[PDB]
Structure formats: C-alpha cells, structure tokens
Amino acid sequence: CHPRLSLHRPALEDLLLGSEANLTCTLTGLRDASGATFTWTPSSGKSAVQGPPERDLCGCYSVSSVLPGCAQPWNHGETFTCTAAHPELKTPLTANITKSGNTFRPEVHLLPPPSEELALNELVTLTCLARGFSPKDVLVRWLQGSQELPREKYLTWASRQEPSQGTTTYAVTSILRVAAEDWKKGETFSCMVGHEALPLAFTQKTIDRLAGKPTHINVSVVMAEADGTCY
C-alpha cells in the first residue's frame, strides 16, 4: 500500500479562542519507520518537531510533524508548502495550503420550543440552525442566563453541504434540553456561532418565553404633545 501525503489547516478553536497556531503536515503509507525530514518555504523560526509514529488499519506506519507560530501569516493570507524525504520513497512529494478566500457568513436562527412539549411539563428543546457559509468549519456554544453551559448537555451534528442554488454552502444544527420550570419562570437562553468570515468572529441570538409563538402581543404607544409648535 503506497505512500501519500496531506496538509491540514489549523484548528478553528485554536484561532478564535487561542494564541498559538499549530500547523501540521503528515505522511501515510509507510512500511515500518524512517528518518524523514520536512520542508516549509517560510522558515524564520522553524522549530518543527515530529513525534513518534502511530499504527493504522491492519498495521500501517503513519508519521507526521507540526509547526508553531503561524497565526499572523495565516490571517494575512500567506502560503505554506510541505515535502517529505525518507528512505522508502523515490522522489519527494509536494502539497500546499492557503487561507480560503471567496467566503460567506452564516445566517443564525434560534427557534422556540414546539407547542406540544409545553403541556407534558417535564423538559423542552431549543434548536439553533446556522446556514449558508462557505468554509465548512464552525463552532456552537450555549449560554444560560449569562453563564456558559458545560459541553456535555447538548448535541451538535457536523457540517454538511446543502443542495445547490448557485455557490456551494453548508449548514449545522444543535439542540439543548432544558427544565420546564425555568422556561415558565422567564429565564433566557442564548446560542453563539463562531465562523471565520464574521466581523468579530462571534455572533449570538437570544430567546425567552415571551418572545416566540407567544399567543399574546401587547403594545402601547403614547404620543404626548402632538400640536405643539415644533421648533
């Protein structure tokens, strides 16, 4: 089973909430091991470490490396190249990666509970859909009141490509199941979405009991001195 090589974009959580930028490069298909080297056309500070190999399907040797300190050329839009040189290979390889232009930003929505889950009076669910963004990386975090809930209380699917209406775009969903006492008190829950193309990399939306399928809409308008020598 012949060798192959691939490059990987830096992780999303390490660019929005993180300071360091671990960029990596790997190599699969090897026989047992080697004494490989790696190359990167930017090298001013090349502290490239490798780490030990790992085993693959039916036994196969995979090896990789990493490169730190990469956030500013990534966001400015520089370029990076990788190549391998090891005994069980004839000629070196080649792969590059670049920060993707031609992007879009998500349209976040937050939906109220259905009407039938309000009568069973145990738990209710809140859906958070993000839609139509060009690179496929995204985050979702929930807040309760104004404090963040722990990650083990909700369920987030993966990003998938949606049917075509022009450019190719993606989508993702999530649900939170919350106690039906706090809904009828009047607490508020919020949903945050983090994407590469948004202005400050985060946005949020908020819902409570009095906003959404409310069966009730009051408004009072008071206009005080309507005939009153307006200058």
Ligand X SMILES: *[C@@H]1O[C@H](CO)[C@@H](O[C@@H]2O[C@H](CO)[C@@H](O[C@@H]3O[C@H](CO)[C@@H](O)[C@H](O)[C@@H]3O)[C@H](O)[C@H]2NC(C)=O)[C@H](O)[C@H]1NC(C)=O
Task: Tell me how far apart the alpha carbons of residues 96 and 107 are, in angstroms, rounded to a whole number.
Answer: 31
Residue 171 contacts which entry, ligand X, a second copy, none (Cβ below 5-8 A, type-dependent): a second copy
- Residue nearest ligand X, CB atom distance: 96
48 near a second copy, judged by CB under 8 A: no
Helix (H) or strand (E) holding 74, with range, is: helix 71-76
Minimum distance from CB of 83 to ligand X (Å)? Answer: 11
Closest residue by Cα to residue 128 from 158, 101, 108 = 108
Residue 96 contacts which entry, ligand X, a second copy, none (Cβ below 5-8 A, type-dependent): ligand X
Q: Which of 96, 103, 121, 206 binds ligand X (CB under 6 A)?
A: 96
Looking at beta carbons only, is 33 or 37 nearer to a second copy? Answer: 33
Residue 230 contacts which entry, a second copy, ligand X, none (Cβ below 5-8 A, type-dependent): none
Minimum distance from CB of 81 to ligand X (Å)? Answer: 6
Looking at beta carbons only, is 96 or 168 nearer to ligand X? Answer: 96
180 near a second copy, judged by CB under 8 A: no
Minimum distance from CB of 95 to a second copy (Å)? Answer: 20
Task: Tell me how far apart the alpha carbons of residues 206 and 226 are, in angstroms, rounded to a whole number.
Answer: 36
Residues 26-85 binding ligand X (CB under 6 A) are 79, 81
Looking at beta carbons only, is 6 or 203 nearer to a second copy? Answer: 203
**Residues whose CB falls within 8 Å of the CB of residue 205, separated by 6 or more in sequence, listed in order:** 108, 109, 110, 128, 190, 191
Q: Which of 31, 37, 45, 50 binds a second copy (CB under 8 A)?
A: 45
206 near ligand X, judged by CB under 6 A: no
Q: What is the dihedral of CA 28, 29, 30, 31, to 10 degrees?
A: 150
Interstrand relation of 147-148 and 154-156 (parallel, antiparallel or unpaired): unpaired
**Residues whose CB falls within 8 Å of the CB of residue 109, separated by 6 or more in sequence, listed in order:** 128, 129, 130, 131, 205
112, 48 Cβ separation under 8 angstroms: no
Q: Which of 107, 144, 182, 209 binds a second copy (CB under 8 A)?
A: 107
Task: Tell me how far apart the alpha carbons of residues 155 and 130 are, in angstroms, rounded to a whole number.
Answer: 14
Q: Which residues bind ligand X (CB under 6 A)?
A: 79, 81, 96
